[PDB]
Amino acid sequence: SNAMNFKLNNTLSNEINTLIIGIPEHLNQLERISFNHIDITESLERLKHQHIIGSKVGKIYTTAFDVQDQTYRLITVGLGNLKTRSYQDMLKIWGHLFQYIKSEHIEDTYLLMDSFISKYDQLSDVLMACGIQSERATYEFDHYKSSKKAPFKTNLNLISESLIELDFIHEGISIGQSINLARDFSNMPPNVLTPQTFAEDIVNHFKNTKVKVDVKDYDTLVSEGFGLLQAVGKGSKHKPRLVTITYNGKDKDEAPIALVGKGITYDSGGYSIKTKNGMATMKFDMCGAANVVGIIEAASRLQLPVNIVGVLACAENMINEASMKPDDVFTALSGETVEVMNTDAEGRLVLADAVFYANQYQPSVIMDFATLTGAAIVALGDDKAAAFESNSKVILNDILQISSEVDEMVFELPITATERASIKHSDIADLVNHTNGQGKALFAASFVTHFSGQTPHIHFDIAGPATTNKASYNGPKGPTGFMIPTIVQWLKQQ
Amino acid sequence: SNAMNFKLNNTLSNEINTLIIGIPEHLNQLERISFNHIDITESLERLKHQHIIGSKVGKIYTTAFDVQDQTYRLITVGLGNLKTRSYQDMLKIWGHLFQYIKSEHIEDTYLLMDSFISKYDQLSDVLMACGIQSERATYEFDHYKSSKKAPFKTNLNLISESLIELDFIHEGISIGQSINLARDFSNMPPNVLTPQTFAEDIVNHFKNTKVKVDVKDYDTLVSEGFGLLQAVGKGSKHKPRLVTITYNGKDKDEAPIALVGKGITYDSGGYSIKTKNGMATMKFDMCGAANVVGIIEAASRLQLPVNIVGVLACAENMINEASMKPDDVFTALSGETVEVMNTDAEGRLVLADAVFYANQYQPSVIMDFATLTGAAIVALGDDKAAAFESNSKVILNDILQISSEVDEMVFELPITATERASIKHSDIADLVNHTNGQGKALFAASFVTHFSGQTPHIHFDIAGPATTNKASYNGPKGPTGFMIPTIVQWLKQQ
């Protein structure tokens, strides 16, 4: 069910006494604002001049507002200069607004949509942002709180002089709810969300949908030779799982798009144990898998004409009497031998088996999503994602463009001859999973992209931007659902 | 069996040729010292003048001493100035004396008690110290040594011109033996003393006494909802236990005094693993529980008119395939959810379940004893205990007074609005068990005292003074039995 209830010009009743208007830097840049049958432009101009309301981007102003005999509660959100209003600004505008609406427990209000739409922007971008933020900005994970407040519906009565389509908002809502679905999996405690229960939850979620889900249990995945996934997950009581998700949106026998996700439900580091502060927030080590589920959820609900195969490598990296150790040599699904020198480099191992398995489906492109390396955070900062291409320079360039347009910072790092050679620097095995040298993020990418062969492969290291430690217009602390907006937008263009 | 055998004015035997006298700074401040019927004051004055004997507090002097025809072995212990003789001085005097007696393998000796008693001190304080130190100062844990010497009895023939009651010494002995009982549990190797065997030993010890013992096994803990105790102890082969100890010293119906003890038989830190030097001496992480047992042992043997309920939360904090991890969320006995961010903060977790359980008995006051925080040691040093009050400002003030009178350094640290708020700083659960900020000892206290509600609660962080790395007049290295003297004295006043 939805956080907001969107209604278009159905009725105008005495029950409702709350009004929402967007305020730009220059009011004359909009078509004269009118509520009921009265022009209210000059009264808003006086309130702006008195500094009772303002235009600062995303700032909330409230005031008592008289129109005719009735006194209304006016809610103002600043739009800034309409000429220089970015997509980020739109997210900030809708974000702060819906957050205010929810925290003030407002159940019934008018929304003057014409004050948000300018001559400068296309209708779809404003309504898309409106739809997404109505779910994404108002997200909360209070399921384990004893003092959780009862969920309520906010009725938004949209008033527009020339608007009929409401589909662009409903499109945004389904994307926003897909992001929140990913967030829910990520926020889940590791003692509750194990590889098994994670698989079971995915099955139950897609049970009555067009999306097919296959779960490969522990004794199947070992006998089928998933050696690396076995190695990583064997140290836990809760054994690893492989989840295959298929969505046939165009139904043609056409080569699917492979989306691979790292589903490490908890990472202790294994025998290469993490520090005290290092283990904090390690339930978020499966964000990659969660975000893949979100992308497929969005694609299916939007009924996009695309074929997608999703592969999730789920495991729990734990210490016990028989868990993986440095010096251990395992046989990958590819048949290649891998020497493990660092058990905290577990992500690239499970991705390797998953990528090789994904390539069996003969996809047009493979995209993997993982919270892999600390070095990627050191490289680009906590708020940007690292992207690596292997035989897919063109598809990456499109994604780097799309991401910059949807307020998601993604930047390229290289895979050179150095990294292609150094993954083979083992005295015993075909491959090694760790280097003591620098450029560790590049090494990890080289390791993962090796298993795709010549198939176009993009690796996304989202160790940084997958989570945030600061609340914003995009929602509270925790999982961000990073990449979902970018990939969905890219999928829309296929 | 007792270390010393106290006999009052027993026949002056020719088999005995050893003599003990206390020597003050001024011999004229005492009643003329006489042995047999002979006045020996002047001869002791000459030996003091020749520096053959002296008065320095707790210093042992020995000499050949002629009285009549027979040559005696004279043993002298300094008393210092009798005007300025503290209770600590008395412990130092009796402590060093009985230690010398035991190391010299003396089996039969006279003790001139009149030389130890002055007009300035209370007779009861001297004889109390005498009784305690006869057991406490002479303590040794040589049960795992192959070269352990055979235990022997020292016959102390007390000579006093005007003394009849010997009950104040026997009172001290039973207190001293209670301290040693606590020490025995603490010194026990962790591979021998597990939560199960610890519970079993308590049952067997109180089997034929007025003290009732109930043991709650692992299956009972889980089905009754001891979630936090379960969480801490599940990682060990030796599963947790809850031990309930009841002593009804006065009445069936009068509100008991709750004594809660942390019984972590071994603390590795869990996945938040300790350093090499950090794990050393971690068998002492159950000193709190051991000292509660000691307090109840003393109260019952002294037949004090008080009702006591003792609750011990026993577990072993270990690493395995399914042990607790940072990010884990558990349901406490209170019904509240707790996010675990640091598995080395295990003490406050087991105390939380124990305190809530203790409060079901509707006690007049709850007192918990635990080796909790390193920050408490940083705060007050290794030799002082940290005390925290919650709705019991008055009872604490009495205890702070009593402790300073029985040579036990205990000082107050605060629980403010800051700490009461910060235990709730979790993005997912009702409570969090760890802060990255400072004032960690205050946080831990706030966490523990939360579970008592409005019931008067005093928390004792004895991480420092529960053990000593230096031998002294109070005994050898290891467990000190800290707080036992203070609480017993407080219980005597109810």
Next chain:
Amino acid sequence: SNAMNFKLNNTLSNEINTLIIGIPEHLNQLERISFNHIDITESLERLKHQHIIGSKVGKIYTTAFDVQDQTYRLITVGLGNLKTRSYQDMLKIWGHLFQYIKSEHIEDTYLLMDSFISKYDQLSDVLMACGIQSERATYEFDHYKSSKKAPFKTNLNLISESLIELDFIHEGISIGQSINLARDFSNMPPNVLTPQTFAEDIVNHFKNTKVKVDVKDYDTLVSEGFGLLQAVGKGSKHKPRLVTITYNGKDKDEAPIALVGKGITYDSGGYSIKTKNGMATMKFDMCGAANVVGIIEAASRLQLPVNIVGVLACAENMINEASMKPDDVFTALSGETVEVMNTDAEGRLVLADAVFYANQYQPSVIMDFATLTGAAIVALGDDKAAAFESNSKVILNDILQISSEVDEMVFELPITATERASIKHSDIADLVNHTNGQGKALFAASFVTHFSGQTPHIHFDIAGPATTNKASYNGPKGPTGFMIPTIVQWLKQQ
């Protein structure tokens, strides 16, 4: 000059169109609120019911407000429940209000003072908080910014039906300005504020006042035997200074109150060098000296009938060819020899010389203020101060009471026989400045309080609360002026 311009019952001006009212949880608890000649209580009740304004403590609400013809800008600050309104609440109320007024660049406004005063609280407390926060909450240090905005005066036209005395506000302003004076010294860059320039600034500040200032230059220090102050400061190009500040508020010759301040303008740690993050914000290592200056500034401007002598030990702890080293032995002003084992324990060294010098004036009490120990922060947290008494148990108890009443968290830590003995644990000198054992804050206090002899001495370790890393109702990040409110209040009661 002043940040706010307070005018009481000033002429009704036709140009002022801004109005400030305090809003409680129940409006009927106040005397019926009236502006101009109109009762506005029931119109405010409707706005509160519509959630246009509210009562949440310290929350700002604004709205268009019609009274008669003219439309006013109404500014509302919540007061909460008037029955349970603490002094902290008052600071939060005035703090957030004046911060809003300044950030909104408001130059002329009405203030309905009667809405802030209740039958439940003392009048003097409301106006005191109003005065302090008008300066303290609005503080900014933008002197080194190129884009610093021009300072402006806000005219506050107070409207009260029964109020004449304005002196309680002017009293608060002078206290607030004294806090800001201390903040200015603390915020000053260490390459600008050296011991010399710090001394020069103090001279120039008190030049035309009742306060006398004496500066002891480097040559005078060594020749007069300030050995410890010399030792600490000799490694810098900018040599140490001793600043003596005398204020005779009552009597030509009556025992003064000694206020000693640590004036380390910069602390690198010396040869016991700090880490990278350790040196950050070390210009605040002279907050103690700055706050003493603030206290004396407040006392003199309030013309309090007290005698005060202020002693400031100013130095810069630097590394060079001849700076102090571990193993160095120096002769203190007392004539005692001190072995330096840790050059980062520089504070206790300069305080020692300053305290001994202060005692020459034969004060009734000595109070020192210093950012000394990291262990004090570990003990009580970053937001509380550690207080230690030596022969002044009574005066401390009064200060601990006063502080809790003026929203300043100060708590006692002990100085025991252990600490009194351990400061003498040197193989070579009379004293040692550092222990490798725990309880380091207690050790430091013992070291400092040693030099006062038997004179009543209170030591304040303000390492934590002297600075804040978070903006609040008390002002921006940086120096807090901690202790100034507490000591001034204490001085008012002499």
